[PDB]
Design an enzyme around this catalytic site. Structure first.
Site, short mmCIF file in Angstrom:
data_model
loop_
_atom_site.label_atom_id
_atom_site.label_comp_id
_atom_site.label_asym_id
_atom_site.label_seq_id
_atom_site.Cartn_x
_atom_site.Cartn_y
_atom_site.Cartn_z
CG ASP A 72 -3.23 -1.50 -32.20
OD1 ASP A 72 -2.78 -0.40 -32.59
OD2 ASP A 72 -3.14 -2.55 -32.91
CG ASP A 110 2.38 -2.09 -39.94
OD1 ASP A 110 2.68 -3.31 -40.03
OD2 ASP A 110 2.04 -1.59 -38.87
NA NA Z 1 -1.35 -2.73 -34.79
#
Ligand code: NA
Ligand SMILES: [K+]
Ligand SMILES: [K+]
Ligand SMILES: [K+]
Ligand code: NA
Ligand code: NA
Ligand code: NA
Ligand code: NA
Ligand code: NA
Length: 739
Positions: free
Chosen positions: A36, A449
């Protein structure tokens, strides 16, 4: 002036969303993946690694690392295309493009489109949007977002125009009220599937299916090569089709559907098959949406085993708890089995063994807690694909990694399949901050993340993310310059699920172990943190809008408000004087000389616009010496911010950091990502900003890179530069400069 360098990634391995997987169906051993935000890769089987294909993408066209779709040419297997562009709102200033290559993505030609693409938008896991006609490789179709409808090329992707006869541009919008434009875009036309049987090689395929994000009309077809279109009669309603794949051996279409576009959600949906010959739709969902009690997920990751096309697989889109489920049918959908099953609660039988030896940090700092595994099989598994030349090989992406098996058919014989990360060479992290302390580990990182790492060896994958506490996303790291075993980090996480944990944490052993004190109420995001030169005190601007800037004399033992400095200011410490701190907010520069208790404005009307926000940093060994990177230039103060001077010749800088001085200099080497002589790249100056040498090249650009940058105080010439979806890259001198 240029200097040859060698560039590598700091070893982490994946760390992001791998949202499409494309094997060439025309010849064995040709495999690509998309991400992405982090370009695309080709699998190099001889060397056992992924090769990144878009690192030539730079700051001028940075959206091109958003990879919307990949198509691989089965007639001429050297050919591959990609649709690229990152957002359709104001966040990507550039239109998208179709890229074409005739050397499997070593080199490319670019055709910009007259509209933006959504490589990192909602719905990105649906696809593939882009498709090549398997009977005539001049012909490609592309399903566009935003109500742009369906596009076609009849010149092998060099030029594109709209199919103005296509009847439905899509209706589904995740959240029409979002005024940022992020959730409020039409998701559009989401995949194209050819019926290869419908023509002979050398003639356009006549039968074409098109998936549309319209729950009332999810599938269209043509039987005349696109001259006319109809809704496929009797198509099921209520769901968006993530995936469509045709089987031209048995003459059926398979689709997998969900109530949302994904990738983070999906609470109901179905799997269907359409028979061309009879016109009959057959529902083949492992758990049908009509079973409202048990169907808590839609479906995606649809793939057919091309060697045995009665074999198909699908994954839950999405099952968060206890894990994802991957389903397999070896009879066309008539019956299914699953990768794990309940035995009696919380116990489960598993059809797999998962080995993360190479990527041990994938436990995310948490022990297994039955029924919840650690590591998990996955989540956000929109992409899954069985190798069309080997029924035993299958890959599936998750939100954090790419998994593979090479013994898939053991499933059918009642055994366990073996699954492991397949991410060598694939680095997809987004970097917020970096430090290289003068003693201890070479590098400590703050990452999206994963939180981040203490990297004992930049060539070796770390054993664990930060723990005690775990951060979802690390935003800031610092060290006490004259007490470099003292480390501080700030980060982001939902407090409700981690009430014993704090958004700021500490180490006194150079980042090997952490501990935490207290924090202000209501903090959820990290913001910026600064460590006094002696490690005795800290100034922190928590991330949430309006949180007061606070200071602690000790390790977050307790926090008090700093006077005179605006919420959410960028905070830095002097690298020499332990009582001096600096802040920048909306063009105003502030200084504290009482250890963060009080600040006063000392300059104003300064840069506030920068490619990664305006960044400034203090120089090791030089009290009051500050460098500031902005869209209008690189600026230098030697009096703690009271006055600034432009560095001559640098027209723009994204960020600036410092490393070990050259031989014969007593000033730290200065590294920037910036623009000099009209050329944006990485540069080093060994003489305090007087002269600059380019240390990268046009093949080693990495897009919107520079959010974080530091030199290494122990290695002359070494630079570590954070990227946004290509992990941490680092550079070493590999030759003498050209001049
Ligand atoms: Na992502
Ligand atoms: K690597
Ligand atoms: K089939
Ligand atoms: K340093
Ligand atoms: Na729109
Ligand atoms: Na769900
Ligand atoms: Na202002
Ligand atoms: Na101001
Ligand atoms: Na020196």
């Amino acid at each position: 002036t240029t200097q040859p360098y060698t560039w590598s990634n700091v070893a982490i391995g994946g760390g992001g969303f791998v949202d499409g997987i494309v094997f060439n169906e025309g010849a064995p051993g040709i495999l690509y993946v998309r991400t992405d935000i982090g370009g695309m890769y080709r699998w190099d089987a001889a060397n056992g690694r992924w090769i990144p294909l878009l690192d030539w993408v730079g700051w001028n066209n940075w959206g091109y690392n958003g990879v919307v779709s990949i198509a691989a040419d089965p007639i001429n297997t050297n050919k591959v295309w990609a649709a690229v562009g990152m957002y359709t709102n104001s966040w990507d200033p550039n239109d998208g493009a179709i890229l074409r290559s005739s050397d499997q993505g070593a080199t490319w030609q670019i055709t910009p489109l007259p509209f933006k693409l959504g490589g990192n938008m909602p719905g990105r896991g649906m696809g593939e949007r882009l498709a090549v006609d398997p009977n005539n490789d001049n012909i490609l179709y592309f399903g566009a977002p935003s109500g742009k409808g369906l596009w076609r090329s009849t010149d092998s992707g060099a030029t594109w125009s709209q199919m103005t006869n296509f009847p439905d541009v899509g209706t589904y919008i995740a959240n029409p009220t979002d005024t940022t434009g992020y959730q409020s875009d039409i998701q559009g036309v989401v995949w194209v599937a050819f019926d290869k049987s419908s023509s002979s090689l050398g003639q356009a395929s006549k039968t074409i299916f098109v998936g549309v994000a319209d729950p009332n009309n999810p599938v269209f077809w043509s039987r005349d090569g696109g001259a006319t279109w109809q809704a496929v009669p009797g198509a099921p309603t209520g769901f968006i089709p993530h995936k469509g794949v045709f089987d031209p051996v048995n003459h059926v279409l398979y689709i997998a559907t969900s109530n949302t576009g994904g990738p983070y959600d999906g609470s109901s949906g179905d799997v269907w098959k359409f028979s061309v010959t009879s016109g009959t739709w057959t529902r083949i969902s492992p758990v049908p949406s009509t079973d409202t009690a048990n169907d808590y997920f839609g479906y995606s990751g649809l793939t057919i085993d091309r060697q045995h096309p009665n074999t198909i697989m699908v994954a839950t889109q999405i099952s968060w708890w206890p894990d994802t489920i991957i389903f397999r049918s070896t009879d066309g959908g008539a019956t299914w089995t699953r990768i794990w099953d309940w035995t009696s609660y919380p116990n489960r039988s598993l059809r797999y063994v998962l080995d993360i030896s190479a990527e041990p940090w994938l436990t995310f700092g948490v022990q297994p807690n039955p029924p919840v595994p650690s590591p998990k099989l996955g989540w956000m598994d929109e992409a899954m694909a069985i190798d069309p030349f080997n029924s035993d090989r299958m890959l599936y992406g998750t939100g954090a990694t790419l998994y593979a098996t090479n013994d898939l058919t053991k499933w059918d014989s009642g055994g366990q399949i073996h699954i492991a990360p397949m991410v060598k060479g694939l680095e997809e992290t987004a970097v917020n901050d970096l430090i290289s302390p003068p003693s201890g580990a070479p590098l400590i990182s703050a990452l999206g993340d994963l939180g981040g790492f203490t990297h004992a060896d930049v060539t070796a994958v770390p054993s664990t993310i930060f723990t005690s506490p775990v951060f979802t996303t690390g935003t800031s790291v610092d060290y006490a310059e004259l007490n470099p075993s003292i480390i501080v980090r700030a980060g982001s996480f939902d407090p409700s699920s981690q009430p014993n944990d704090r958004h700021v944490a500490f180490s006194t052993d150079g980042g090997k172990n952490w501990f935490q004190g207290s924090e202000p109420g209501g903090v959820t995001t990290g913001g910026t943190v600064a460590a006094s030169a002696d490690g005795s005190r800290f100034v922190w601007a928590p991330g949430d809008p309006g949180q007061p800037v606070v200071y602690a004399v000790g390790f977050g033992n307790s926090w008090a408000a700093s006077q005179g400095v605006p919420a959410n200011a960028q905070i830095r410490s002097d690298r020499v004087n332990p009582k001096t701190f600096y802040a920048l907010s909306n063009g105003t520069f502030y200084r504290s000389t009482d250890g963060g208790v009080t600040f006063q404005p000392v300059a104003a009307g300064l840069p506030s616009s920068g490619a990664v926000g305006v960044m400034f940093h203090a120089v090791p060994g030089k009290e009051g010496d500050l460098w500031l990177a902005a869209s209008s230039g690189l600026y230098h103060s030697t009096n703690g911010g009271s006055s600034w001077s432009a560095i001559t010749g640098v027209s723009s800088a994204v960020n600036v950091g410092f490393g070990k001085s050259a031989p014969g200099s007593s000033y730290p080497a200065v590294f920037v990502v910036g623009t000099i002589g009209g050329v944006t790249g990485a540069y080093r100056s060994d003489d305090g900003g007087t002269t600059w040498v380019r240390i990268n090249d046009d093949q080693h650009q990495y897009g919107n890179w520079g959010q974080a940058i530091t030199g290494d105080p122990r290695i002359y010439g070494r630079v570590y530069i954070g990227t946004n979806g290509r992990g941490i890259v680092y550079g070493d001198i590999a030759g003498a400069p050209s001049g």
